[model samples]
Target chain A: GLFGAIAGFIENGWEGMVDGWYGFRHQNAQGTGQAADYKSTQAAIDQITGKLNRIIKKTNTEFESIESEFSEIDHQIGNVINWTKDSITDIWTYQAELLVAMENQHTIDMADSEMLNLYERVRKQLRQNAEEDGKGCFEIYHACDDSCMESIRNNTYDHSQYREEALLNRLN
Target chain B: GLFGAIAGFIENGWEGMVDGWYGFRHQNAQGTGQAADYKSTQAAIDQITGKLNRIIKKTNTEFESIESEFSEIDHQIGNVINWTKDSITDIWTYQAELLVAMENQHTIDMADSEMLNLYERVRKQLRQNAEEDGKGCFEIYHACDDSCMESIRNNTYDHSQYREEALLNRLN
Candidate 1:
């Protein structure tokens, strides 16, 4: 299904392994025709592989940036109250502040999960298309199906996932 | 250079608008040659357009997720000190805390800038490839140039860009 889309492109080749009526008919090619067919098919495979590699690089950069941000944000969360002591001088209000902190952590946790999901999808697709069977045609239609990247976007914010008790314990 | 890559695929067509050597040789097709070229080209355009649109949607979702995380993280920064009253009990420590908070905000700010850059690149490319000139050919080679996501990933973190005085005043 994935490589099927590109099959039309291969079919239009002037002298390639693919024929409109017959597929991978490199045998019909006399002399240079044989080489042309193999080259054409190989070219398509190379193009797809290159694109996937580039996408993987970009995805890695994105993941690293997110990770750095998360680390810094966590630092801010665990320390901000002491920075402005003149205003937030209440011991009892710690609980209220904690409620917001836990929820914030949960929000970013979901975002982190989404990025991880997208990364895995790309990696999996790349692996599938690398096999010998994947040499002539595309094995997958889309790099990311409908299920990926929707984790943070479609779901409503849920507070129950992060236990306050665990968060407090972790902080201590 | 964009659509040129896919031109190889179209050249192998059984009967289409494109001919390998004599481009647009639909004149040779006695009856259906004329319509074939138009349909083949149209199909390619539609495929590329659909892909760009889907990528745009995913990019927007990613941007929204980042925005939500930033908002929650900021909330955590502005209120975390009051949450736990045991440790961080000093007024002078506020400056050190401010330093980290400012840097954290700046880190996310850079991440935000990177996302915006990617979104604009996609939009601009989509617009360019939509014009009549873009109908049969690919206008751009890449969705994001090398410069797009490197904002946060490549640059060394600089605290000098943020002023401690400004942060103090803002908090005040």
Candidate 2:
């Protein structure tokens, strides 16, 4: 099963341990009447391995990009999503201020204080909910719920398993 | 732009160059006197990071398991897709045979000859194209015009300067 997935790529995910198909490709090279040309057999195996390699590498890239996406997602979640969600200054009346915070986090005109204020504001909610088992904070805001950036980021703002699975299935 | 995505995972289709946001989290911790108890701040960040870690780990499991699926998909592509497209010997012209082959690859019950025949048969098609500029063996076969595993992978199969941005616009 794993013979198909080698890992010179790295240790945890997939590095090493792939010894190549070893001499298996050559075993039947001589058996066939076409006259065993190791060249041709190797070529064929190379073809297969190449396909596998490309597949592996492609998945590899996904993993890599995904790894980065996690960081961004975290940051975004922190500054963009969580920041926005937690920015309920009134704790009673909330608008897309979280939305505005995300939109504003990168804007030049929005003073850094404004953005940080919004970010800290949300963290306060976590303080209020600190006793709850729920993590520090999470938000249900997407560009769509909010698509200003959704169209650009296409990110999911909900905690639903739907997006989570889409993200995980990619891991598959 | 970053702060959206984070890691404790493997690194290409992923990256190693990612350096986290140096300090914004603490940048305003002092200026704003919510007097964020460094304890709670860490706890909250810990909570977020912890959630992110669990998310990372779950995704890791998905990645680990996915490596194997590649082999099957490859095998299926060769046996099912390529074979169906090629329609080779009746000795293998059935579902049960392929199923038995996959399920019994390591078993003594599997006739090495039958498996070899099937594997080689697929390679031979490549042999025909062996001389072409295209690498030794390539297949015109795919799940769709060559669903080519692209649709299934919903991945680059192969890049997505190619996908994400387009999808993002849709989100927009």
Candidate 3:
């Protein structure tokens, strides 16, 4: 029933309305050399221009929000790396004291000899820790850089700059 | 000089170099447990995840091809309106031709018309066309209404039956 009703409307009612509006628009434009019969072309132009302006403004606001979000994430990541570094350093200090105590006792067994190999293990662990720290720093830096570049690339403000520049050049 | 330098580089120095390739993306995603190591990460994941891939693809293809050229200036404002309507109708055959013609004609004149007489003159023109063509033809009928409602809107091939049902209901 709905399909039939819609089909009927299209077959009969829609065409006339569309044609009337079209004709009305044409005659109004032709008679006065204006875009609309309203107060000014400004009204009609505003319809589209206003929407576009709002879209751009909202987009810019969102980008700023994203920038803030990225900064927070970076900060949190930095704190984690710092915590890990402190933990590793604390372990090394404790291990050094343990080794000195074992040597003073002068009762170090063969098993102790093999197990007290703190220097090599500690050195290797510290190297891994340094690598991890370096990586953490690099990640934050890269994420911030990439995110900023991405916002610049995708945001409408980037294209609007080109459009505004073109308009200015044309006016000049 | 800048043009000449670019030409010289293209002719002599350009080879198999991927021109836009900036050095390897410094993604230190492994640090802080968040820095993803490229070697360990999935290639598909990177392609699917990063905004860089999407932005570059859009920039190089979609955004580059957007319409930027100004429309040809028509001597008579009516001609411009007619041309615009013609363009719209070409794509959306059901669009009310008369309405588009009227609207476009109005737009051209409004862009050029002076303040004092523009509104009254355009309104009178609209009234005259409505009297002749029927009061509401332009108001109701649109260019894409017919084809869009009947075919495209109702398309079920891509599981668009819900959209089609909604459109049919609206029309009814």
Candidate 4:
């Protein structure tokens, strides 16, 4: 179970990270009205994807054993779990960006204008999605914290019970 | 002992395989009498070298563990050891070819016939060295096999002892 969770998290995190950086590069390059070729751009993307796959596979396996223990209290400890995922996502994003830069060093020709424009527009949409998704995940943690704090202050229910109940409820 | 033998084999194998291919490509390209830029060729060579480095590093830890067992047999393994070193040397030759290719690719617009001539010469040398080195390694393996088989047939050594002795001799 832990292995499965960690693997799932890494896979999703990798996809998000690659898509994020690609979107950023697409926007930046297109903003300058520069052209890029399918071969070079696609080559860069493929390289990042390949590297991310390898990294996530090796790392996720090592972290799999701890996944279940984390999941058991994930809802009550929403921020911690979210932070872990975010950090992994960041790693993926950084690695993808690094690969793009490395490949760009060997690029001899620029990409075509039409492709550049399309990539830019698509990237803008992706960036917006990433922002929104990040905020939504954060909100879950804030809401859980707020509820737990309220229960503790009201002296109406055992905060420990409240924490467990909150976790169970979120699980459902 | 087995580990060192395999590492030596793989390192040499990698060198031989890559050099053989590079030599083939260099010669085939030059035969057309068309001038190829150094940078392009160098880029390909660098790419292959990067791959070889990755493979070696990935296997290094495991090989180190195995090498500890073969400490007593290190001296007699000159042929296999030399093959490994030669394999590494062959990779260096390909790397040189890549540097030439990269330089040519970058300065192709201003290159003269002299530059082309230099490329052709280096390429030819790389090809010749790769083929000759590969043949040498293969002959070593063939000799080892023949010697082992003769020893077994003559009832001079048991199969297991012969195998250990052969491996030990290589380590020596």
lDDT of 3 by residue, A125-151 (tens): 322111111101101111122333233
* True lDDT of residue B154, candidate 4: 34
Which candidate tops TM-score?
A: 1
lDDT digits (tens) for residues A82-151 of candidate 4:
4445544544554454445444543311222223334334324332122111111111211223433333
For candidate 3, write residues B81-134 as lDDT tens digits.
Answer: 455446544634432354346435533332222211222222222321211123
Best by DockQ: 1
For model 4, the stretches where C-alpha displacement exceeds 4 angstroms are A1-102, A106-172, B1-75, B109-172
Docking class of 2: incorrect
Summing lDDT over every window of 10 consecutive residues in candidate 4 chain A, give the lowest-scoring window.
A132-141
Candidate 2 residue lDDT tens string, A29-144: 22311112232234335444543442242111111111233344445424543433343333313322442353333232212222222233233222211121232222322211
Mark the regions of model 1 whose C-alpha exceeds 4 Å error after superposition. A1-139, A142-172, B1-99, B102-106, B127-172
lDDT of 1 by residue, A1-172 (tens): 1223223223343344343312221211122122122333344445446534532431111111112334444555334433544344553266337534743553333333332323222322332122223323222212222332222123321222323433343335
After TM-score superposition, what is the CA distance of residue B164 in candidate 1 from its true location, in Å?
Answer: 55
Native A-B contacts reproduced, model 2? 0.00
For candidate 3, give the DockQ.
0.01
lDDT of 2 at A116: 27
User: Native contacts recovered, in order, as a fraction for each?
Assistant: 0.03, 0.00, 0.00, 0.00
User: Candidate 4: which docking quality band?
Assistant: incorrect
> What lDDT score goes with residue A28 in model 2?
24
Candidate 4: what lDDT? 0.33
How many clashes show up per model?
16, 33, 37, 22
